[PDB]
Amino acid sequence: PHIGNYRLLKTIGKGNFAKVKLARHILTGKEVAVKIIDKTQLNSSSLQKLFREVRIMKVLNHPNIVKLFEVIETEKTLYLVMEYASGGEVFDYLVAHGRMKEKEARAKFRQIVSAVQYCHQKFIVHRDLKAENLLLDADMNIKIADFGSPPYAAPELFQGKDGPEVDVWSLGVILYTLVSGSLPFDNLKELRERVLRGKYRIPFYMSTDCENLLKKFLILNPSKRGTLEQIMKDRWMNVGHEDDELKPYVEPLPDYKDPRRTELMVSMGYTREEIQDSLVGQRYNEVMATYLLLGY
Numbered sequence: 001p002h003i004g005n006y007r008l009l010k011t012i013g014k015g016n017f018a019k020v021k022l023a024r025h026i027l028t029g030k031e032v033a034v035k036i037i038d039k040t041q042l043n044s045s046s047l048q049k050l051f052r053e054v055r056i057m058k059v060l061n062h063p064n065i066v067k068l069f070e071v072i073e074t075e076k077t078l079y080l081v082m083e084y085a086s087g088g089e090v091f092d093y094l095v096a097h098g099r100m101k102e103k104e105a106r107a108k109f110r111q112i113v114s115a116v117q118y119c120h121q122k123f124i125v126h127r128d129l130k131a132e133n134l135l136l137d138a139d140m141n142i143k144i145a146d147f148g149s150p151p152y153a154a155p156e157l158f159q160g161k162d163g164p165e166v167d168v169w170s171l172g173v174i175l176y177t178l179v180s181g182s183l184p185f186d187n188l189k190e191l192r193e194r195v196l197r198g199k200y201r202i203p204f205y206m207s208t209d210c211e212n213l214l215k216k217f218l219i220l221n222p223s224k225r226g227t228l229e230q231i232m233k234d235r236w237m238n239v240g241h242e243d244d245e246l247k248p249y250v251e252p253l254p255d256y257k258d259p260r261r262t263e264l265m266v267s268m269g270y271t272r273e274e275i276q277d278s279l280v281g282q283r284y285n286e287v288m289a290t291y292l293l294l295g296y
Protein backbone atom coordinates (compact mmCIF):
# COMPACT_ATOMS: atom_id res chain seq x y z
CA PRO A 1 0.00 0.00 0.00
CA HIS A 2 2.77 2.47 -1.08
CA ILE A 3 3.19 3.04 -4.91
CA GLY A 4 5.52 6.01 -5.31
CA ASN A 5 4.25 9.24 -3.66
CA TYR A 6 0.90 7.56 -2.83
CA ARG A 7 -0.39 5.32 0.00
CA LEU A 8 -2.99 2.85 -1.29
CA LEU A 9 -6.31 2.59 0.57
CA LYS A 10 -9.47 0.79 -0.81
CA THR A 11 -9.96 -0.92 -4.26
CA ILE A 12 -12.91 1.03 -5.79
CA GLY A 13 -12.73 -1.33 -8.82
CA LYS A 14 -11.02 -4.37 -10.36
CA GLY A 15 -11.00 -6.00 -13.80
CA ASN A 16 -9.12 -7.38 -16.81
CA PHE A 17 -5.45 -6.72 -15.72
CA ALA A 18 -6.41 -3.02 -14.92
CA LYS A 19 -7.49 -2.15 -11.34
CA VAL A 20 -8.44 1.22 -9.74
CA LYS A 21 -7.39 1.82 -6.13
CA LEU A 22 -8.37 4.79 -3.93
CA ALA A 23 -5.12 6.39 -2.64
CA ARG A 24 -3.69 9.46 -0.89
CA HIS A 25 -0.91 11.84 -2.12
CA ILE A 26 1.44 11.58 0.88
CA LEU A 27 3.03 15.12 0.44
CA THR A 28 -0.40 16.96 0.20
CA GLY A 29 -2.76 14.55 2.06
CA LYS A 30 -5.09 14.67 -1.01
CA GLU A 31 -7.46 11.83 -2.15
CA VAL A 32 -6.89 10.33 -5.63
CA ALA A 33 -7.87 7.25 -7.66
CA VAL A 34 -4.87 5.28 -9.14
CA LYS A 35 -5.58 3.28 -12.36
CA ILE A 36 -3.01 0.40 -12.13
CA ILE A 37 -2.55 -1.22 -15.62
CA ASP A 38 -0.50 -4.42 -16.23
CA LYS A 39 0.80 -3.98 -19.81
CA THR A 40 2.30 -7.54 -19.95
CA GLN A 41 -1.24 -8.97 -20.26
CA LEU A 42 -2.59 -6.21 -22.64
CA ASN A 43 -3.13 -7.12 -26.32
CA SER A 44 -1.92 -5.34 -29.53
CA SER A 45 -4.97 -3.01 -29.94
CA SER A 46 -5.70 -2.21 -26.21
CA LEU A 47 -2.18 -0.81 -25.62
CA GLN A 48 -2.69 1.55 -28.64
CA LYS A 49 -6.06 2.62 -27.12
CA LEU A 50 -4.38 3.02 -23.62
CA PHE A 51 -1.62 5.31 -24.98
CA ARG A 52 -4.33 7.28 -26.87
CA GLU A 53 -6.16 7.82 -23.48
CA VAL A 54 -2.97 8.94 -21.63
CA ARG A 55 -2.21 11.36 -24.57
CA ILE A 56 -5.80 12.81 -24.45
CA MET A 57 -6.06 13.00 -20.62
CA LYS A 58 -2.95 15.23 -20.64
CA VAL A 59 -4.39 17.98 -22.95
CA LEU A 60 -7.85 18.36 -21.22
CA ASN A 61 -8.56 20.78 -18.31
CA HIS A 62 -12.40 20.95 -17.79
CA PRO A 63 -14.12 20.94 -14.33
CA ASN A 64 -16.38 18.06 -15.56
CA ILE A 65 -13.68 15.69 -17.01
CA VAL A 66 -11.53 13.68 -14.56
CA LYS A 67 -8.16 15.41 -14.15
CA LEU A 68 -4.95 13.45 -14.54
CA PHE A 69 -2.17 14.38 -12.06
CA GLU A 70 0.66 11.87 -12.53
CA VAL A 71 1.84 9.15 -14.91
CA ILE A 72 4.10 6.57 -13.13
CA GLU A 73 5.64 4.30 -15.71
CA THR A 74 7.44 0.98 -15.26
CA GLU A 75 8.25 -1.59 -18.00
CA LYS A 76 5.39 -3.98 -17.07
CA THR A 77 3.05 -1.62 -15.10
CA LEU A 78 1.50 1.78 -15.82
CA TYR A 79 0.05 3.97 -12.99
CA LEU A 80 -2.38 6.78 -13.88
CA VAL A 81 -3.25 9.12 -10.97
CA MET A 82 -6.62 10.80 -11.47
CA GLU A 83 -9.11 12.79 -9.42
CA TYR A 84 -11.43 10.53 -7.40
CA ALA A 85 -15.21 11.17 -7.98
CA SER A 86 -16.73 10.51 -4.49
CA GLY A 87 -20.42 10.51 -5.61
CA GLY A 88 -20.06 7.31 -7.68
CA GLU A 89 -21.70 6.13 -10.93
CA VAL A 90 -24.59 8.12 -12.48
CA PHE A 91 -25.88 4.59 -13.38
CA ASP A 92 -26.29 3.56 -9.68
CA TYR A 93 -27.93 6.98 -9.05
CA LEU A 94 -30.48 6.45 -11.92
CA VAL A 95 -31.01 2.93 -10.44
CA ALA A 96 -31.58 4.25 -6.84
CA HIS A 97 -33.21 7.74 -7.46
CA GLY A 98 -35.42 6.17 -10.19
CA ARG A 99 -34.88 8.96 -12.82
CA MET A 100 -33.93 12.70 -12.90
CA LYS A 101 -36.32 15.63 -12.95
CA GLU A 102 -35.57 17.90 -16.01
CA LYS A 103 -34.29 20.67 -13.61
CA GLU A 104 -31.66 18.24 -12.10
CA ALA A 105 -30.93 16.58 -15.47
CA ARG A 106 -30.39 20.11 -16.99
CA ALA A 107 -27.67 20.96 -14.42
CA LYS A 108 -25.76 17.73 -15.08
CA PHE A 109 -26.45 17.81 -18.91
CA ARG A 110 -25.15 21.40 -19.26
CA GLN A 111 -21.82 20.06 -17.88
CA ILE A 112 -21.86 16.89 -20.09
CA VAL A 113 -22.45 19.00 -23.29
CA SER A 114 -19.86 21.63 -22.16
CA ALA A 115 -17.21 18.90 -21.50
CA VAL A 116 -17.83 16.93 -24.74
CA GLN A 117 -17.79 20.16 -26.81
CA TYR A 118 -14.49 21.22 -25.08
CA CYS A 119 -12.93 17.96 -26.44
CA HIS A 120 -14.35 18.93 -29.88
CA GLN A 121 -12.65 22.39 -29.72
CA LYS A 122 -9.40 20.36 -29.53
CA PHE A 123 -10.53 17.95 -32.31
CA ILE A 124 -10.97 15.02 -29.85
CA VAL A 125 -14.01 12.68 -30.25
CA HIS A 126 -14.92 10.18 -27.41
CA ARG A 127 -16.61 7.85 -30.02
CA ASP A 128 -18.26 5.91 -27.07
CA LEU A 129 -20.25 7.91 -24.47
CA LYS A 130 -22.25 5.79 -21.92
CA ALA A 131 -24.20 6.36 -18.62
CA GLU A 132 -21.54 3.94 -17.13
CA ASN A 133 -18.70 6.21 -18.35
CA LEU A 134 -20.26 9.16 -16.35
CA LEU A 135 -19.23 9.80 -12.67
CA LEU A 136 -20.34 12.17 -9.90
CA ASP A 137 -18.11 14.15 -7.53
CA ALA A 138 -18.76 15.18 -3.90
CA ASP A 139 -21.17 18.02 -4.93
CA MET A 140 -23.04 15.79 -7.49
CA ASN A 141 -21.30 17.40 -10.55
CA ILE A 142 -20.62 15.29 -13.68
CA LYS A 143 -17.04 13.95 -14.05
CA ILE A 144 -16.48 12.20 -17.39
CA ALA A 145 -14.29 9.16 -16.65
CA ASP A 146 -12.19 7.75 -19.48
CA PHE A 147 -11.55 6.89 -23.15
CA GLY A 148 -10.15 3.37 -22.23
CA SER A 149 -22.33 0.42 -25.41
CA PRO A 150 -24.43 -0.36 -28.66
CA PRO A 151 -27.73 1.55 -27.70
CA TYR A 152 -25.45 4.66 -27.57
CA ALA A 153 -24.29 4.08 -31.20
CA ALA A 154 -25.28 6.43 -34.09
CA PRO A 155 -27.27 5.25 -37.22
CA GLU A 156 -24.34 5.49 -39.72
CA LEU A 157 -22.26 3.50 -37.17
CA PHE A 158 -24.45 0.51 -38.11
CA GLN A 159 -24.82 1.55 -41.82
CA GLY A 160 -21.02 1.18 -42.12
CA LYS A 161 -19.55 4.71 -42.18
CA ASP A 162 -16.45 8.55 -37.08
CA GLY A 163 -16.11 12.34 -36.29
CA PRO A 164 -17.94 14.77 -33.91
CA GLU A 165 -21.37 14.03 -35.47
CA VAL A 166 -21.26 10.63 -33.62
CA ASP A 167 -20.90 12.21 -30.11
CA VAL A 168 -23.98 14.40 -30.82
CA TRP A 169 -26.15 11.24 -31.28
CA SER A 170 -24.77 9.62 -28.02
CA LEU A 171 -25.62 12.85 -26.03
CA GLY A 172 -29.23 12.57 -27.22
CA VAL A 173 -29.26 8.98 -25.87
CA ILE A 174 -27.55 10.20 -22.57
CA LEU A 175 -30.15 13.06 -22.16
CA TYR A 176 -33.06 10.66 -22.70
CA THR A 177 -31.35 8.14 -20.31
CA LEU A 178 -31.08 10.85 -17.58
CA VAL A 179 -34.70 12.22 -17.73
CA SER A 180 -36.51 8.83 -18.24
CA GLY A 181 -34.22 6.30 -16.51
CA SER A 182 -34.30 4.02 -19.59
CA LEU A 183 -32.64 3.62 -23.04
CA PRO A 184 -34.45 5.13 -26.08
CA PHE A 185 -33.73 2.13 -28.39
CA ASP A 186 -33.63 -1.70 -27.77
CA ASN A 187 -30.31 -9.38 -29.67
CA LEU A 188 -29.04 -7.12 -32.61
CA LYS A 189 -31.31 -6.32 -35.64
CA GLU A 190 -34.10 -5.24 -33.19
CA LEU A 191 -31.68 -2.54 -31.86
CA ARG A 192 -30.29 -2.02 -35.42
CA GLU A 193 -33.91 -1.42 -36.70
CA ARG A 194 -35.18 0.74 -33.77
CA VAL A 195 -32.02 2.95 -33.95
CA LEU A 196 -32.37 3.17 -37.79
CA ARG A 197 -36.10 4.01 -37.56
CA GLY A 198 -35.20 6.89 -35.23
CA LYS A 199 -38.56 6.66 -33.45
CA TYR A 200 -38.05 6.37 -29.64
CA ARG A 201 -40.75 6.16 -26.97
CA ILE A 202 -41.62 9.69 -25.64
CA PRO A 203 -42.42 9.33 -21.85
CA PHE A 204 -45.73 10.90 -20.67
CA TYR A 205 -43.96 13.24 -18.17
CA MET A 206 -41.52 14.72 -20.76
CA SER A 207 -41.84 18.41 -21.70
CA THR A 208 -42.29 19.75 -25.28
CA ASP A 209 -39.06 21.66 -24.43
CA CYS A 210 -37.02 18.50 -23.70
CA GLU A 211 -38.41 16.62 -26.74
CA ASN A 212 -37.28 19.49 -29.09
CA LEU A 213 -33.72 19.17 -27.75
CA LEU A 214 -33.84 15.40 -28.25
CA LYS A 215 -34.83 16.14 -31.87
CA LYS A 216 -31.72 18.37 -32.20
CA PHE A 217 -29.50 15.36 -31.23
CA LEU A 218 -31.28 12.22 -32.46
CA ILE A 219 -31.32 12.92 -36.26
CA LEU A 220 -30.81 9.94 -38.68
CA ASN A 221 -28.76 11.97 -41.22
CA PRO A 222 -25.17 12.42 -39.85
CA SER A 223 -24.72 15.38 -42.24
CA LYS A 224 -27.98 17.05 -40.95
CA ARG A 225 -27.13 16.71 -37.19
CA GLY A 226 -26.50 20.04 -35.47
CA THR A 227 -23.16 21.05 -33.90
CA LEU A 228 -22.72 21.13 -30.11
CA GLU A 229 -22.23 24.92 -30.34
CA GLN A 230 -25.58 25.43 -32.04
CA ILE A 231 -27.30 22.91 -29.63
CA MET A 232 -25.86 24.90 -26.64
CA LYS A 233 -28.19 27.86 -27.46
CA ASP A 234 -31.33 25.59 -27.14
CA ARG A 235 -34.15 26.84 -24.83
CA TRP A 236 -34.21 23.70 -22.59
CA MET A 237 -30.42 24.06 -22.13
CA ASN A 238 -30.89 27.61 -20.62
CA VAL A 239 -34.09 27.30 -18.43
CA GLY A 240 -33.07 29.12 -15.23
CA HIS A 241 -29.85 30.30 -16.95
CA GLU A 242 -31.28 33.30 -18.89
CA ASP A 243 -28.38 35.73 -18.15
CA ASP A 244 -25.81 32.85 -18.23
CA GLU A 245 -26.40 31.14 -21.63
CA LEU A 246 -24.28 27.97 -22.25
CA LYS A 247 -21.22 28.91 -24.34
CA PRO A 248 -18.25 26.74 -25.56
CA TYR A 249 -15.99 26.04 -22.54
CA VAL A 250 -13.90 28.97 -21.27
CA GLU A 251 -10.52 27.11 -20.66
CA PRO A 252 -8.57 29.01 -17.95
CA LEU A 253 -5.17 30.58 -18.64
CA PRO A 254 -2.09 28.80 -17.20
CA ASP A 255 -0.99 29.66 -13.65
CA TYR A 256 2.33 27.82 -13.64
CA LYS A 257 3.85 30.27 -11.07
CA ASP A 258 1.46 30.33 -8.03
CA PRO A 259 3.59 31.71 -5.13
CA ARG A 260 1.70 29.80 -2.35
CA ARG A 261 2.34 26.36 -3.99
CA THR A 262 5.88 27.14 -5.29
CA GLU A 263 7.12 28.19 -1.77
CA LEU A 264 5.67 24.97 -0.32
CA MET A 265 7.26 22.99 -3.17
CA VAL A 266 10.71 24.67 -2.93
CA SER A 267 10.48 23.82 0.84
CA MET A 268 9.92 20.12 -0.22
CA GLY A 269 13.31 20.09 -2.04
CA TYR A 270 11.94 20.94 -5.49
CA THR A 271 13.90 23.51 -7.57
CA ARG A 272 11.92 26.52 -8.87
CA GLU A 273 13.21 25.68 -12.39
CA GLU A 274 12.06 22.02 -12.27
CA ILE A 275 8.58 23.20 -11.10
CA GLN A 276 8.39 25.51 -14.17
CA ASP A 277 9.93 23.04 -16.71
CA SER A 278 7.57 20.18 -15.62
CA LEU A 279 4.43 22.33 -16.10
CA VAL A 280 5.54 24.09 -19.35
CA GLY A 281 6.75 20.66 -20.62
CA GLN A 282 3.43 19.18 -19.21
CA ARG A 283 5.45 16.15 -18.05
CA TYR A 284 2.83 14.82 -15.46
CA ASN A 285 5.74 13.77 -13.24
CA GLU A 286 5.97 13.86 -9.39
CA VAL A 287 6.68 17.63 -9.59
CA MET A 288 3.57 18.37 -11.76
CA ALA A 289 1.35 16.04 -9.62
CA THR A 290 2.45 17.76 -6.31
CA TYR A 291 1.70 21.25 -7.83
CA LEU A 292 -1.77 20.46 -9.30
CA LEU A 293 -2.86 18.67 -6.06
CA LEU A 294 -1.54 21.56 -3.85
CA GLY A 295 -4.16 23.66 -5.66
CA TYR A 296 -7.23 22.18 -3.91
Ligand SMILES: C[C@@H](c1ccc(F)cc1)N1C(=O)C(C)(C)c2cnc(Nc3cccnc3)nc21
Residues within 6 Å of the ligand: 012, 013, 020, 033, 034, 035, 066, 082, 083, 084, 085, 086, 087, 088, 089, 090, 131, 132, 133, 134, 135, 145, 146
Ligand atom coordinates in the same frame (compact mmCIF):
# COMPACT_ATOMS: atom_id res chain seq x y z
C1 LIG B 1 -13.22 2.70 -10.80
C2 LIG B 1 -13.43 3.64 -12.00
C3 LIG B 1 -14.82 3.79 -12.52
C4 LIG B 1 -15.02 4.71 -13.57
C5 LIG B 1 -16.28 4.89 -14.13
C6 LIG B 1 -17.37 4.13 -13.65
F1 LIG B 1 -18.60 4.31 -14.18
C7 LIG B 1 -17.18 3.19 -12.62
C8 LIG B 1 -15.90 3.03 -12.06
N1 LIG B 1 -12.71 4.93 -11.90
C9 LIG B 1 -11.67 5.32 -12.67
O1 LIG B 1 -11.15 4.59 -13.66
C10 LIG B 1 -11.21 6.59 -12.29
C11 LIG B 1 -11.36 7.57 -13.43
C12 LIG B 1 -9.75 6.47 -11.90
C13 LIG B 1 -12.05 6.92 -11.21
C14 LIG B 1 -12.20 8.02 -10.35
N2 LIG B 1 -13.15 8.08 -9.37
C15 LIG B 1 -14.01 7.05 -9.24
N3 LIG B 1 -15.01 7.04 -8.33
C16 LIG B 1 -15.98 6.16 -8.00
C17 LIG B 1 -16.59 5.23 -8.87
C18 LIG B 1 -17.56 4.33 -8.43
C19 LIG B 1 -17.91 4.39 -7.08
N4 LIG B 1 -17.37 5.26 -6.18
C20 LIG B 1 -16.42 6.11 -6.67
N5 LIG B 1 -13.95 5.96 -10.05
C21 LIG B 1 -12.99 5.92 -11.01
